[PDB]
Design a protein around this ligand. Structure first.
Ligand SMILES: CC(C)C1=C(C(=O)N2CCC[C@H]2C(=O)N(C)C)SC2=N[C@@](C)(c3ccc(Cl)cc3)[C@@H](c3ccc(Cl)cc3)N21
Length: 85
């Protein structure tokens, strides 16, 4: 009840990087989302603060083509839209 419950499309995201649970602290979520971005190589060599998720499950979930890591509010909005209420 400290924790938060992923909607199952994001929870399938988390397991494609080795996650075992189905509830999580925010930290776990942020950390797994980062696995993803760095494993699936979703970024520009030119400007590395932009993540491009255009043709990818991540983009699906967040409903965007791309977004900047410097933009937290906007990130948490995207994450929460995927949290079981
Ligand atoms: C991938 C991740 C481990 C990490 C960053 C990261 O390392 N990235 C960004 C893509 C290219 C690569 C890079 O070389 N940079 C240092 C800019 S830069 C960076 N900052 C972190 C810690 C972060 C965490 C929470 C928020 Cl709300 C925003 C940013 C965190 C993060 C976590 C979740 C998401 Cl969805 C996006 C970014 N993040």
């Amino acid at each position: 009840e400290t924790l938060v419950r992923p909607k199952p499309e994001l929870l399938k995201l988390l397991k494609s990087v080795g996650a075992q649970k189905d509830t999580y602290t925010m930290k776990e979520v942020l950390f797994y989302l980062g696995q993803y971005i760095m494993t699936k190589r979703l970024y520009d060599e030119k400007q590395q603060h932009i993540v491009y998720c255009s043709n990818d499950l991540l983009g699906d979930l967040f409903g965007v083509p791309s977004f900047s890591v410097k933009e937290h509010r906007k990130i948490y909005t995207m994450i929460y839209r995927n949290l079981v209420v």
